[PDB]
Design a protein around this ligand. Sequence first.
Ligand SMILES: Nc1ncnc2c1ncn2[C@@H]1O[C@H](COP(=O)(O)OP(=O)(O)OP(=O)(O)O)[C@@H](O)[C@H]1O
Ligand SMILES: [Mg+2]
Lengths: 50, 101, 100, 209, 287, 28
Amino acid sequence: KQYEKSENDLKALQSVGQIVGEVLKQLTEEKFIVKATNGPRYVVGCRRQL
Amino acid sequence: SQLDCNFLKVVSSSIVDKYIGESARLIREMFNYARDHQPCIIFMDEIDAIGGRRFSEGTSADREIQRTLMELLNQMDGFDTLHRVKMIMATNRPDTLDPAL
Amino acid sequence: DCTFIRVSGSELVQKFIGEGARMVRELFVMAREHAPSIIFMDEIDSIGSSRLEGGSGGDSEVQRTMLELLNQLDGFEATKNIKVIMATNRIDILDSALLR
Amino acid sequence: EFLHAQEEVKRIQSIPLVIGQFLEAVDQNTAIVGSTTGSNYYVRILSTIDRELLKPNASVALHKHSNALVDVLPPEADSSIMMLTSDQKPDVMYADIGGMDIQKQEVREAVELPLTHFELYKQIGIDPPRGVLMYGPPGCGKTMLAKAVAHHTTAAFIRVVGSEFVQKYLGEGPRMVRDVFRLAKENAPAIIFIDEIDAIATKRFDAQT
Amino acid sequence: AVDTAEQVYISSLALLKMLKHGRAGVPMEVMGLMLGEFVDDYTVRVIDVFAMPQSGTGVSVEAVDPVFQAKMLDMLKQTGRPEMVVGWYHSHPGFGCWLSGVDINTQQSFEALSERAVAVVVDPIQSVKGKVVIDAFRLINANMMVLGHEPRQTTSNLGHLNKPSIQALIHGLNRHYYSITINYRKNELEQKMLLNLHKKSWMEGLTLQDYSEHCKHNESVVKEMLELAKNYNKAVEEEDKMTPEQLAIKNVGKQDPKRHLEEHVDVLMTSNIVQCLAAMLDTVVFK
Amino acid sequence: XXXXXXXXXXXXXXXXXXXXXXXXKXXX
Ligand SMILES: Nc1ncnc2c1ncn2[C@@H]1O[C@H](COP(=O)(O)OP(=O)(O)OP(=O)(O)O)[C@@H](O)[C@H]1O
Ligand SMILES: [Mg+2]
């Protein structure tokens, strides 16, 4: 039971956080203009199935 | 005590801050949260902190209060109308209030 | 029959800090370059500054321009061919006693 | 081979792109852009970009690491605010207002009429007005008339609050004013409505605090 | 026993299996095996590429059950022929196409099993419709860091196809591995049909578009071409004596004479000539 | 004539950048 807690923490370590932002507009089908909350703007894309 | 889920209470004195914006930014977030849940109740006791009437170009700190006050005068009537949003207001003296309110 | 020069210069130039120390300089170059000339003014400084009221508490950039106005007029004209004309309401606010 | 050469340059975009705005140009194929990272640079530009797209202070794309001009965006992209979108007409008919027949007729010709009869002003020498101001006691139909005119128009309509550009940053205020007015120039015959300019248009002075 | 100037042969089916699996799994590394034959001690030849079911994170990707693996190769033997695994591949999306610290860890796993196991890097993001950024690497020992690793009896893998890029030698070249060259072998049968897949039937060659819109398009283009000529009279006459690089800085902006004027003439030419000439043949040929 | 005042704050913005050639694993 205590080993099960350790194995959950082995899985938990390699998680990486994600940037939170807001979509400004849709440029093309795969180009999007978003903006980070702290500042600047970017040109991004989705994955496939969003 | 009837609803207990859909009731917003504001002290109307912790709205102020040290920055220049950031007091309006609470009020926009409040009504937008009141926009999302549809049958909302707003309660602001003791408006007389934020309420006031008007000053003839006094302190710049008064201008921060009046700009904060005019966001209420906008977003009660303004462009976007409201639906199922009720606002209870309470005070001790009503004479010191803005006649536009 | 003199070259008229109207300076509006109301407050859009009062904010301009970095060039605020030259706007009177080349203007008085322009007056002594073109012709016997006449420069016209208005209420614009009195709305900007009067005296040391906005003094040691930040200098407000506008009275410092007024000290450069007083600097050149102290320097040398003897009118030489050039008058300046100023017209105002709200007459009892500015620093005219030093300027008398 | 030159048309094969143009296509092989195009790997430089690849969309991790950052967004700036064009500012000025020095000479042939070298310019100045102002980034949205706060700072200001001196960059190089591709020979591919058609030079007709420049100077509205256009929204432009930039490289991450090397920070060069790579792409010219559509000009309405970096705006951060939208117009009256598609359906938010506030459901006020023109005949809903009762008994404002002087002022309803006056504002209606103040907005729509110089789109057609522009040269009648100059032949008289009127110099037609850019803007109009409304005022009165609180609740004499100031907002409703502006509310009704959005329903029975076809032009672009941008509602503007009094005091939203007062954020606690350095100069976001004047940046947002540029974002509004470029959007009005870009779109159409447009209408800008700024309710409650009393929050900003004050008389007093610059108190240095 | 020594290396040489090696050469990676391909199959044309492989590269399309490379990028489409890479593009459809874009925001992470997607993995796959590589399937070919060791034709000599000098060159290597891949003919087939297939993937496996996987499970990924934002920073790592893993495979799942190996019961898919041997059963996949079993049913590829009985249909066609048996063949040989030669290596593997994955993606580095938007990266500098370089072997990562986990990518190198699966290579002493693979080089100990078979010798010339090739690691292959693809990127479907820095690849434009003109050209593909394909990449392949080959691990070297650290025990032979002083002794020579290639005998270098020719020039073909030394100064050709590039000098190594600055964003890839910052991790790799020539530490811990060495790069390898890639070409494209082509059978004649697919070469003949890869040539002709953008052509149509005779229906497309004998259309007459429609004379209403064709006259409308000519009515359209000439009308603004009048206005381009209005602006063209002003600018050519203007010519402020400005030492024309200053002419070449006041023209970036809205300025465009002489550029649309060559353009619309080309459009009005090629439209009207083909519309006439195809209408010529439909009377000479037909009846 | 004898009147006090309060104050306010205008906080500056902040931005950061790197060469971005650093990998973040080292685990495994
Ligand atoms: N002529 C009219 N016909 C119908 N309703 C009217 C008329 N004039 C005013 N109203 C009422 O006034 C409101 C219109 O908005 P309002 O007049 O409050 O904007 P305003 O004058 O800017 O007010 P405030 O200055 O307080 O913001 C509506 O709620 C409507 O009930
Ligand atoms: Mg109103």
